[PDB]
Amino acid sequence: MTSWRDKSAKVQVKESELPSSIPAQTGLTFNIWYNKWSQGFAGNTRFVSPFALQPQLHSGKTRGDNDGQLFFCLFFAKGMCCLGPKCEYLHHIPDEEDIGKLALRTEVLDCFGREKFADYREDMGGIGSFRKKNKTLYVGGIDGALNSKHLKPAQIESRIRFVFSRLGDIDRIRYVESKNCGFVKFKYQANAEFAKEAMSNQTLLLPSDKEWDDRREGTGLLVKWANEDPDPAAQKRLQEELKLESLNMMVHLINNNTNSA
Amino acid sequence: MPRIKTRRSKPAPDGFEKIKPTLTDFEIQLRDAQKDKSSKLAAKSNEQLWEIMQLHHQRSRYIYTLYYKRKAISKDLYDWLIKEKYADKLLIAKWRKTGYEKLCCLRCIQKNETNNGSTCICRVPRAQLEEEARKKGTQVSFHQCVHCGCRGCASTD
Amino acid sequence: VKVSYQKLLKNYVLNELHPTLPTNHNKTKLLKSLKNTKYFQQTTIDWVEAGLQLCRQGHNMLNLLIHRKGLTYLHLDYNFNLKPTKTLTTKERKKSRLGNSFHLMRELLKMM
Amino acid sequence: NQPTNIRTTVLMDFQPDVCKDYKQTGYCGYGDSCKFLHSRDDFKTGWK
Amino acid sequence: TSHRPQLEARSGAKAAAYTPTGIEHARLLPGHTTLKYRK
Amino acid sequence: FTKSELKRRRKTRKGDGPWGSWS
Amino acid sequence: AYTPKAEMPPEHLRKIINTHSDMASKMYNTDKKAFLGALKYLPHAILKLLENMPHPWEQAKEVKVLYHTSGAITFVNETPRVIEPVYTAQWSATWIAMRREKRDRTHFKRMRFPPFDDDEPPLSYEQHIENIEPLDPINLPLDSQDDEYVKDWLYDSRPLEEDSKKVN
Amino acid sequence: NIEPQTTAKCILYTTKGNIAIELWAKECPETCKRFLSMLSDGTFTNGEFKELKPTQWLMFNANSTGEYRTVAEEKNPRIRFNRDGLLGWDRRRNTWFITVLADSKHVLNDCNVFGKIVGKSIYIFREILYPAVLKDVEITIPFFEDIFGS
Amino acid sequence: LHGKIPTLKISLIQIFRAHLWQKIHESIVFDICQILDGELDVLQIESVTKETVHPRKSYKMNSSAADITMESVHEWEVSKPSLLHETNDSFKGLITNKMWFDVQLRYGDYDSHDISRYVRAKFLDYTTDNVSMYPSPTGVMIGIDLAYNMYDAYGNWFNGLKPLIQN
Amino acid sequence: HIIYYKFNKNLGKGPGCGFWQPAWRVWLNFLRGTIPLLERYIGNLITRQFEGRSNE
RNA sequence: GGAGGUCAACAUCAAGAACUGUGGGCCUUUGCCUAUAGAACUUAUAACGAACAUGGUUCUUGCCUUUUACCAGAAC
RNA sequence: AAUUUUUAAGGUAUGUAUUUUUUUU
Ligand SMILES: [Mg+2]
Ligand SMILES: [Zn+2]
Ligand SMILES: [Zn+2]
Ligand SMILES: [Zn+2]
Ligand SMILES: [Zn+2]
Ligand SMILES: [Zn+2]
Structure with a gap:
């Protein structure tokens, strides 16, 4: 409101600035068809995203609102959108008022209007399945934070809790020390997807702490969909949270029958 | 006939x-409109063409007004401006018709x-679209003809 | 030359002797059906410009087919000579065997 | 009398005809019949 | 031991298309387009 | 609607006709 | 219905075609399939292009084209027509120009083939060729008086276009 | 390979040797009337060769002809850097750009390319491989003699 | 090779194997370098220094670059360019400091031409071309037909050079 | 041959020529009949290139 | 309303020297006889084109390690 | 009294693995 409502989002990046196509010299010759560097061996293509957003600062009103297009600008989510007020998609972090209108179609396709696929993907990649509603996100490659290491999970946890916080709701967050993986569950489906695109290939710490200026260089961090929680602790809870939701969904379903008569 | 000054062409009146x-x-x-900037976005790429279609529109109105409004040029010179393709004859011929005076293009009236149906929403009066939008109160959704970039050819607006 | 006059006569006679007698209902033509759609649009232009334009067109077509097939070691120069850039293993060799459609087409563009 | 005005692009012949079995092994099955070179070269003091 | 050859139906149930993939053979080009009836 | 209403109304568009932007 | 096709600005085509020069973007995925799909028709575009060549008494012909809006191919859509006797006169007349100019100058140089090197990308029309004024064609002196009838309209591209009596 | 044609010729007499020059008048006439005029105006004479940029270019004669102002930019794609020793024009006021062996394409479209060096006297320029000075400037073949000394 | 003709291709790949073309070129350059290096006193030569040659220069037939470069104790009175065996020489035309030698090999055919015409045609061709980088506009182009065991040189000669390069 | 020895009569062996109408026609006709070849060939090559070859 | 359009659709263009419509008569409308109206375009040293290409199948051949690519005559 | 020129393929295999940021007990 005070942040998003009045403003029309400032253009994140000038047209001139946006990275060019043709990633540089992975291979001996460029392939015009598949845009890739053909002959030779790649040495990990992945890099840290030179761009990221400012959830409060860039968000604003746009032409998608007047149209009232449901779907969100993803190039906004990457903070890379060059259209800004002339973009035809919504710029902001999802709220429950906009989610409610999407709530019809959020099963077959994500918040950005990208159709889901049935089987997921080997490594749990970009978009999930329309078979399962997965609210749980996985973070990996904490080396995106780079070499600078933090004294305990407190630094990590709080940082992750801070960064993902702005991107929507949070049901819970668990970092693991033994394995460098932090599981994040937003309250809502749509929010989990918006965080995935926004936070992938990113760095960490504060704006100006330690090696931040050379931060751009590293491997970058994974943000992937997450497997079911195997421990019977949450496996009871996931199933218990399942049933209690199911009971809520019997009543409304006998209510529109109670309406039907 | 040709734009070029080929020896066949007749010297200007x-x-x-x-x-x-x-x-x-x-x-x-x-x-400078055709010099090929490299623009990545598909929404930008057609926005470049919208500069040519306009500069083509604007050059013919100039020749249209002189002769058919201000009567400021001879009919010899005008007939010579159409050969040399400084003006699009079939476009101007719509400008003389009733209802079509402010038209974009000959593509926008293609049935x-x-x-x-037919005829770009680019040919529909703003006064109307506001009203069918009024039923929904949504302040329409229309901005630019995908062929052109026009907003309201229709001669009332 | 007298041989030339004989050869030309031979061709002349073999045309006169077997005719062909065209196809009523052929009245449907490629371009006439092609201009009907949204996608093709019409204008004038100078001849040499259309020649240059078609050269660029052709070169892009053949590069996209070649690279599509996965052959980046074969290089089309701008005069439509298809040159290998490198020594090829047999698998390279068998995939880059390349038919008469591609080559005939390319030679035809070379004349143009 | 090759014509006066022509440029012919050199097209490199990159394929060597070296017989790959006789280059590696030093034995070729085909013998004196082999359609290829038989020339036998070896690398450059790689080993320590 | 050829034993059981190959059934047509499995080749006739393939999802290429009604026709083949759309390859145009040189012997399927229209020829002898008209029939001839007996008295 | 009326002719006067339209004639007055149009000049609102930024740039003459017809590429002039409404709003 | 059926309104005829709308002639356009050549500038539009030019921008299309030189835009599609460089494509590495994802936006071109359906404009590359159009390039491949267009390869089937290319040998016809070569036909129509090459049967409309200028002829020597022409400095330039301006011919209609029919282009794919993705810039995938460009067909020359005219067909040439000629009055048979007028055409024979033109070719015969140049003929005499050829013999007179062959006997005229002592050294006759001939163009090197190919004219342009393999690595030089084909030069654009609007930059290179468009600005220059054209060199004169062959014509023939044709006589001051005898030929007064034909001499005016002889070497025109289409010798008589606007004559109500002389031609359809 | 394909250069439109050399319509202007102005010989430079330096200390290190006599540098011939051929020019394209028609393709960039604005740059010509800055170049030749200052040779008629003599403001180039006694110029130190200033800044070499290895693999890039060498510079001299910095002062500006008109009102210490710029020049209308013009280019032709037929004229590119495929060679060493193309006379060139920097964005900064009235500055020659003399392409060294490395003849890069990136400084292209940073400059207005202007003229060549005659194939015979290119060797004298390669002697740069105590700056040179310009004693005397003769103009062998003028092109546009109107407005020149008029 | 003007055809396909595989048997000829195979014989000709035997005759040149283990990079014999390059080794002939390096071999002639080296012996010319020693012979010039022995005349430092007589011909008034400051230094004879053979350059660093691109690995492919030997068999690249479009462009060339000098191999051995020269420099004079003082200065040199050079002639017009002429053939190795021609006699009348007026040394008063040009004056230089550096000389260069190209050693250009060639493998001839039945239609090929005599070597002299090839050596002069390439000399004018390269030295007037903009692709080839030569140190100074005077030099000698030494050709050899490998197939016919024939040689010539079309250079700019100064007093004392022809009676060497002949011998 | 026919065009030369009618053209070059009384003058020269030289390169001067430029009566190109017969050859141009000959090539245009060759084109007239190789359009259906290249359309069938290239049609097959591309319809196989996108859609793969038949299994049967 | 006329003159036009390198505009479009539809119909037609190798047959007893070769087209249709109509009235009447025999048959009982096909078909036969008779009277009559109208026949644009293409045809006799034969044809829409004062022009001239390619492919397929089957025969007879020519090159000849086999297929492609080909030699050159015929019929369809 | 007049022929006629060239490119591919049957020869140097083929197959498997290999550059990855640590899915909650
Ligand atoms: Mg076999
Ligand atoms: Zn956006
Ligand atoms: Zn329009
Ligand atoms: Zn429109
Ligand atoms: Zn409009
Ligand atoms: Zn062997």
Whole structure:
């Protein structure tokens, strides 16, 4: 409101600035068809995203609102959108008022209007399945934070809790020390997807702490969909949270029958 | 016939010198409209073309007004401006018709090409679209003709 | 030359002797059906410009087919000579065997 | 009398005809019949 | 031991298309387009 | 609607006709 | 219905075609399939292009084209027509120009083939060729008086276009 | 390979040797009337060769002809850097750009390319491989003699 | 090779194997370098220094670059360019400091031409071309037909050079 | 041959020529009949390139 | 309303020297006889084109390690 | 009294693995 409502989002990046196509010299010759560097061996293509957003600062009103297009600008989510007020998609972090209108179609396709696929993907990649509603996100490659290491999970946890916080709701967050993986569950489906695109290939710490200026260089961090929680602790809870939701969904379903008569 | 000064072409009639610089200011713009900036976005790529279609529209109105409004050029010179393709004859012929005076293009009135029905919403008066939007109170959704960039050819607006 | 006059006569006679007698209902032509759609649009232009344009067109077509097939070691120069850039293993060799459609087409563009 | 005005692009012949079995092994099955070179070269003091 | 050859139906149930993939053979080009009836 | 209403109304568009932007 | 096709600005085509020069973007995925799909028709575009060549008494012909809006191919859509006797006169007349100019100058140089090197990308029309004024064609002196009838309209591209009596 | 044609010729007499020059008048006439005029105006004479940029270019004669102002930019794609020793024009006021062996394409479209060196006297320029000075400037073949000394 | 003709291709790949073309070129350059290096006193030569040659220069037939470069104790009175065996020489035309030698090999055919015409045609061709980088506009182009065991040189000669390069 | 020895009669062996109408026609006709070849060939090559070859 | 359009659709263009419509008569409308109206375009040293290409199948051949690519005559 | 020129393929295999940021007990 005070942040998003009045403003029309400032253009994140000038047209001139946006990275060019043709990633540089992975291979001996460029392939015009598949845009890739053909002959030779790649040495990990992945890099840290030179761009990221400012959830409060860039968000604003746009032409998608007047149209009232449901779907969100993803190039906004990457903070890379060059259209800004002339973009035809919504710029902001999802709220429950906009989610409610999407709530019809959020099963077959994500918040950005990208159709889901049935089987997921080997490594749990970009978009999930329309078979399962997965609210749980996985973070990996904490080396995106780079070499600078933090004294305990407190630094990590709080940082992750801070960064993902702005991107929507949070049901819970668990970092693991033994394995460098932090599981994040937003309250809502749509929010989990918006965080995935926004936070992938990113760095960490504060704006100006330690090696931040050379931060751009590293491997970058994974943000992937997450497997079911195997421990019977949450496996009871996931199933218990399942049933209690199911009971809520019997009543409304006998209510529109109670309406039907 | 040809734009080029090929020896076959006839030297310009009398009144051409007075309007010659005014046309060239369109010409040197067009040379810069086609220079091929590299633009990644598909929404930008057609926005470049929208500069040509406009500069083509704007150069013909200039020749249209002089002769068919201000009557400021001879009919010899005008007939010579159509050969040399400084003006699009079939476009101007719509400008003389009733209802079509402010038209974009000959593509915007194509009945055939468009999927259902015809005639870009680009030809529909703003006064109306506001009203069918009024039923929904949504302040329409229309901005630019995908062929052109037009907003309201229809001659009321 | 007298041989030339004989050869030309031979061709002349073999045309006169077997005719062909065209196809009523052929009245449907490629371009006439092609201009009907949204996608093709019409204008004038100078001849040499259309020649240059078609050269660029052709070169892009053949590069996209070649690279599509996965052959980046074969290089089309701008005069439509298809040159290998490198020594090829047999698998390279068998995939880059390349038919008469591609080559005939390319030679035809070379004349143009 | 090759025509006066022509440029012919050199097209490199990159394929060597070296017989790959006789280059590696030093034995070729085909013998004196082999359609290829038989020339036998070896690398450059790689080993320590 | 050829044993059981190959059934047509499995080749007739393939999802290429009604026709083949759309390859145009040189012997399927229209020829002898008209029939001839007996008295 | 009325002719006067339209004639007055149009000049609102930024740039003459017809590429002039409404709003 | 059926309104005829709408002629356009050549500038539009030019921008299309030189835009599609460089494509590495994802936006071109359906404009590359159009390039491949267009390869089937290319040998016809070569036909129509090459049967409309200028002829020597022409400095330039301006011919209609029919282009794919993705810039995938460009067909020359005219067909040439000629009055048979007028055409024979033109070719015969140049003929005499050829013999007179062959006997005229002592050294006759001939163009090197190919004219342009393999690595030089084909030069654009609007930059290179468009600005220059054209060199004169062959014509023939043709006589001051005898030929007064034909001499005016002889070497025109289409010798008589606007004559109500002389031609359809 | 394909250069439109050399319509202007102005010989430079330096200390290190006599540098011939051929020019394209028609393709960039604005740059010509800055170049030749200052040779007629003599403001180039006694110029130190200033800044070499290895693999890039060498510079001299910095002062500006008109009102210490710029020049209308013009280019032709037929004229590119495929060679060493193309006379060139920097964005900064009235500055020659003399392309060294490395003849890069990136400084292209940073400059207005202007003229060549005659194939015979290119060797004298390669002697740069105590700056040179310009004693005397003769113009062998003028092109546009109107407005020149008039 | 003007055809396909595989048997000829195979014989000709035997005759040149283990980079014999390059080794002939390096071999002639080296012996010319020693012979010039022995005349430092007589011909008034400051230094004879053979350059660093691109690995492919030997068999690249479009462009060339000098191999051995020269420099004079003082200065040199050079002639017009002429053939190795021609006699009348007026040394008063040009004056230089550096000389260069190209050693250009060639493998001839039945239609090939005599070597002299090839050596002069390439000399004018390269030295007037903009692709080839030569140190100074005077030099000698030494050709050899490998197939015919024939040689010539078309250079700019100064007093004392022809009676060497002949011998 | 026919065009030369009618053209070059009384003058020269030289390169001067430029009566190109017969050859131009000959090539245009060759084109007239190789359009259906290249359309069938290239049609097959591309319809196989996108859609793969038949299994049967 | 006329003159036009390198505009479009539809119909037609190798047959007893070769087209249709109509009235009447025999048959009982096909078909036969008779009277009559109208026949644009293409045809006799034969044809829409004062022009001239390619492919397929089957025969007879020519090159000849086999297929492609080909030699050159015929019929369809 | 007049022929006629060239490119591919049957020869140097083929197959498997290999550059990855640590899915909650
Ligand atoms: Mg076999
Ligand atoms: Zn956006
Ligand atoms: Zn329009
Ligand atoms: Zn429109
Ligand atoms: Zn409009
Ligand atoms: Zn062997």
